[PDB]
Amino acid sequence: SSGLVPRGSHMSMDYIKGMTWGWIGNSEDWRSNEAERSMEEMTNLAINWTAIAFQGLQETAHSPDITFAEPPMVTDENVRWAIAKAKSLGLSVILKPIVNVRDGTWRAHINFFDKDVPCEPTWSQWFKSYESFMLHYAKLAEDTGCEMLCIGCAMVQTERREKEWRDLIQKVRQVYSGIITYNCDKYQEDEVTWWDAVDVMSSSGYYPIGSWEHHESRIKKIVESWQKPFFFMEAGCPSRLESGSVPYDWNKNRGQIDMDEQRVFYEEMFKFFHGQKWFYGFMLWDWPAKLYRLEDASENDDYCVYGKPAAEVIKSFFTSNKIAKR
Amino acid sequence: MDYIKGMTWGWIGNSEDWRSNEAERSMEEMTNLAINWTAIAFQGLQETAHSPDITFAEPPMVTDENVRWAIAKAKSLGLSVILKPIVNVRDGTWRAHINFFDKDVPCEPTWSQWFKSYESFMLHYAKLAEDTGCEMLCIGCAMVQTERREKEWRDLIQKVRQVYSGIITYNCDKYQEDEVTWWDAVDVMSSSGYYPIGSWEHHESRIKKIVESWQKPFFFMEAGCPSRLESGSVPYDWNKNRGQIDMDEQRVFYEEMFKFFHGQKWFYGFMLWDWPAKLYRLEDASENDDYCVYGKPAAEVIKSFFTSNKIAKR
Numbered sequence: 001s002s003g004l005v006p007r008g009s010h011m012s013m014d015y016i017k018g019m020t021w022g023w024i025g026n027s028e029d030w031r032s033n034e035a036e037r038s039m040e041e042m043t044n045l046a047i048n049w050t051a052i053a054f055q056g057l058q059e060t061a062h063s064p065d066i067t068f069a070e071p072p073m074v075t076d077e078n079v080r081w082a083i084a085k086a087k088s089l090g091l092s093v094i095l096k097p098i099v100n101v102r103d104g105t106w107r108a109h110i111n112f113f114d115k116d117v118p119c120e121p122t123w124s125q126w127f128k129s130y131e132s133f134m135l136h137y138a139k140l141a142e143d144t145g146c147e148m149l150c151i152g153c154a155m156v157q158t159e160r161r162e163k164e165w166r167d168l169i170q171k172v173r174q175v176y177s178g179i180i181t182y183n184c185d186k187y188q189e190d191e192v193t194w195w196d197a198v199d200v201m202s203s204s205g206y207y208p209i210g211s212w213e214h215h216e217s218r219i220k221k222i223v224e225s226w227q228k229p230f231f232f233m234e235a236g237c238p239s240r241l242e243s244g245s246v247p248y249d250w251n252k253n254r255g256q257i258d259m260d261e262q263r264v265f266y267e268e269m270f271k272f273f274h275g276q277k278w279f280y281g282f283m284l285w286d287w288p289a290k291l292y293r294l295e296d297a298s299e300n301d302d303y304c305v306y307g308k309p310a311a312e313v314i315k316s317f318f319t320s321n322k323i324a325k326r
Numbered sequence: 327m328d329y330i331k332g333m334t335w336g337w338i339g340n341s342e343d344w345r346s347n348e349a350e351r352s353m354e355e356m357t358n359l360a361i362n363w364t365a366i367a368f369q370g371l372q373e374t375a376h377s378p379d380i381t382f383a384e385p386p387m388v389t390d391e392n393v394r395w396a397i398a399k400a401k402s403l404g405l406s407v408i409l410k411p412i413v414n415v416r417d418g419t420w421r422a423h424i425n426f427f428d429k430d431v432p433c434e435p436t437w438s439q440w441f442k443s444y445e446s447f448m449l450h451y452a453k454l455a456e457d458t459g460c461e462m463l464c465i466g467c468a469m470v471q472t473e474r475r476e477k478e479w480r481d482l483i484q485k486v487r488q489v490y491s492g493i494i495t496y497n498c499d500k501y502q503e504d505e506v507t508w509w510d511a512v513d514v515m516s517s518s519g520y521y522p523i524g525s526w527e528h529h530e531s532r533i534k535k536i537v538e539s540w541q542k543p544f545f546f547m548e549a550g551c552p553s554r555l556e557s558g559s560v561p562y563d564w565n566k567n568r569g570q571i572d573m574d575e576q577r578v579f580y581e582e583m584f585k586f587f588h589g590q591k592w593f594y595g596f597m598l599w600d601w602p603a604k605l606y607r608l609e610d611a612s613e614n615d616d617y618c619v620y621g622k623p624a625a626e627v628i629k630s631f632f633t634s635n636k637i638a639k640r
Contacts, residue, residue: 061375062423103417109376111425113470117501119520119562156427187431206433248433 003227004278006199010179013200013229014092014147015326016281017318018049020234022082022289024100025054027071029289030078036085038291043089045311046318051094051150051233051283052082056133061105061157062112064125066133068097076140083144092147094181094233094283097137099130099155108185111157127164131171138176149176150233154185154204162194169197183233186248189222200280201226202233205273206248209265212272220278229280232273236285236303237265239310255301259309266305266313275322284314327493327514327543328406328461329640330595331632332363334548336396336603338414339368341385343603344392350399352605357403359625360632365408365464365547365597366396370447375419376426378439380447382411390454397458408462408495408547408597411451413444413469422499425471441478445485452490463490464547468499468518476508483511497547500562503536514594515540516547519587520562523578526586537592544592550599550617551579553624569615573623580619580627589636598628 005012019042022030029035042050056068069076079095086093099107116122134151141149151172152158159165165182172180181202184192189203201223207215223230237247241256244265273279286303297307305311317323333356336344343349356364370382383390393409400407413421430436448465455463465486466472473479479496486494495516498506503517515537521529537544551561555570558579587593600617611621619625631637 060419062419105374105376108427109425111423111471113422114474115502115505117499119500119560157425160428185431186433188429191429246433 001196002199004229006179006229010177010199013179013280014049015323016049016231016283017047017323018051018094018281018283019045019047020051020053020096020283020286021086022074023053023055023286025074026289027074027078030074030082032290034291035082035289038287038289039082039085039089041291041306042287043091044315045284045305046315047091047284049092049094049147049283050086051096052079052086052146053096053098053286054079055098055100057100057102058110058129059102061101061103061107061109062121064112064121064129066099066129068133068136079137079140080144083146087145093144094148094150095137095141095144095146096150096153096183096233097134098153099133106154108154108156110155123161123164126158127161127168131168134168135171135175138172141178142176146178148179148181148200150181150183150202151198153183153233154188156185156188156191159184159188159192165194166197169194181231181233189219189230195226195228198228201228201230202283203230204248204285205232205235205269205282206237207269208247209244209268212268216272216276220276223278230278231280232282234285235269235282237262237310238301238303239308240301250303253301257299257301259298262305263309263313266310266317270313270317274317275326281323281326327594328363329589329637330363330545330597331361331637332365332408332595332597333359333361334365334367334410334597334600335400336388337367337600339388340603341388341392344388344396346604348605349396349603352601352603353396353399353403355605355620356601357405358629359598359619360629361405363406363408363461363597364400365410366393366400367410367412367600368393369412369414371414371416372424372443373416375415375417375421375423376435378426378435378443380413380443382447382450393451393454394458397460401459406461407458408464409451409455409460410464410467410497410547411447412467413447420468422468422470424469437475437478441475441482445482448482449485449489452486455492456490460492462493462495462514464495464497464516465512467497467547468502470499470502470505473498473502473506479508480511483508495547503533503544509540509542513543515542515544516597517544518562518599519546519549519583519596520551521583522561523558523582526582530586530590534590534592543594545594546587546596548599549583549596550619551576551624552615552617553619553622554615564617567615571613571615573612576619577623577627580624580631584627584631588631589640595640
């Protein structure tokens with residue numbers, strides 16, 4: 001394994017100044033002329049990384065089959081395009097294949113019985129399907145020279161399957177030679193028992209306004225106990241009334257615009273998580289393939305910071321000397 | 327502990343159905359199976375497998391009066407009663423997937439929230455069970471992804487013991503007899519015997535070892551098979567081959583089950599699945615695809631088994 005620095009062959013670890021691009025991963029959106037303009041515009045955040053994020057799908061939280069690279073999901077060609085375009089813009093890339101559930105159930109609920117029973121689908125079946133999905137993209141990440149692969153995102157009810165996760169990572173190592181991360185959910189940084197199996201620890205930093213100092217203290221101790229580099233694989237807040245109290249809640253107060261609430265979230269997050277030597281930055285959430293007009297920004301309720309005060313907080317943080325030296 | 331010769335009545339628990347004139351006739355007809363027990367079964371509801379609020383005794387679910395009626399009617403027919411309140415999920419998800427994060431997080435509902443709601447639900451019915459003199463209370467049914475929450479199940483059982491003085495059972499799912507670490511907390515172990523045709527001999531040997539290791543009484547809280555093509559291969563699959571009628575398949579299931587599970591001293595019988603409040607006409611029996619054995623060859627297997635001397639001796 002390795003400690004604070006991934007082994008040289010997989011590359012100190014780079015400080016991540018990033019923005020997530022492409023969610024939810026719709027072929028028609030990625031293939032549009034608008035996609036190229038969106039990605040170009042995103043570079044004005046002064047980012048040096050992007051997470052190319054897109055979905056795979058399973059019917060229910062308890063079904064074993066995962067479908068990917070089928071309409072309306074992204075084609076391998078769309079993926080190669082996004083990676084290459086990002087690189088052409090001078091960005092390092094984190095490939096982020098994410099399994100969603102067709103019935104709308106949050107992926108964190110994906111789960112099977114601890115004990116295999118004849119009358120139900122098993123962990124073995126699901127992990128075989130998830131391995132097919134993640135190895136497909138791991139091979140794509142290798143072929144396209146992606147600097148990092150995120151092998152999962154907030155798969156809370158799967159994390160206890162340590163043997164299966166280690167087995168999957170071993171297979172990933174065989175086809176992908178870059179940096180591996182797993183993105184645990186918010187509040188779960190101390191719950192993953194197999195952090196030693198990945199190069200870099202990562203979590204979703206959707207911590208509420210007024211809690212960042214507390215979370216810095218908590219996370220710092222967890223990271224120090226693992227001796228691994230750590231960064232936020234997701235961090236953001238919608239521009240809506242009271243969203244800073246629940247930054248992860250994408251359904252909170254839809255259409256109730258509050259630019260200032262998003263701005264305050266970003267100022268507090270960067271106040272407590274900045275240039276500490278154990279911390280390796282931010283993959284922000286998020287930026288769409290089809291971006292709204294700058295003139296509609298003041299009435300937009302999304303996580304996107306484009307044309308909003310938060311974008312300026314991000315830009316000044318990512319161009320500031322303390323962060324630019326990292 | 328009594329040897330249980332039973333049939334489940336009332337599922338899914340619809341007030342309108344239970345208050346119909348048909349309900350009394352259905353229960354009376356059920357006594358011709360030569361049963362000495364019934365499980366009065368009915369649902370409560372939660373929105374999703376991951377929501378903490380359970381609703382009960384609200385339309386279209388059974389009223390307390392409906393429940394008091396079912397219990398009293400069964401007892402007036404000479405039957406002992408197992409009260410069986412069952413939580414279902416409105417979105418259709420099987421209750422066995424009801425589940426919360428092992429770690430409490432501020433952004434999600436918690437086990438304590440769900441258990442508090444489950445406690446209100448179960449204690450309401452426990453009190454009703456005490457007031458109506460139910461001989462047994464079943465405190466849950468195939469709640470697989472809750473069973474690891476041992477402290478919370480034992481806390482719930484402690485509260486139930488404070489308001490209900492009868493026999494307590496927990497109905498684990500099929501194949502889960504050896505997966506419950508808290509069988510000591512209940513009076514009698516029970517499971518859902520939906521074992522396929524050709525497997526009963528193996529299951530008798532498997533279950534005997536489990537029950538003997540615990541040194542507690544055991545019975546099937548559910549067992550049955552739809553009268554459908556190939557249903558005996560997957561007796562628990564209520565969605566299998568709807569409308570493809572096979573009376574013989576159901577008959578064979580029953581004959582095999584009774585051949586392997588009968589009068590063993592550690593075995594306490596069967597609570598069969600199931601019998602509706604609104605029973606179909608005897609003339610429609612041959613085209614009926616339900617678990618119900620009414621007007622089918624299986625009913626005859628059950629009757630001869632329950633009235634046989636070997637089982638009459640238990």
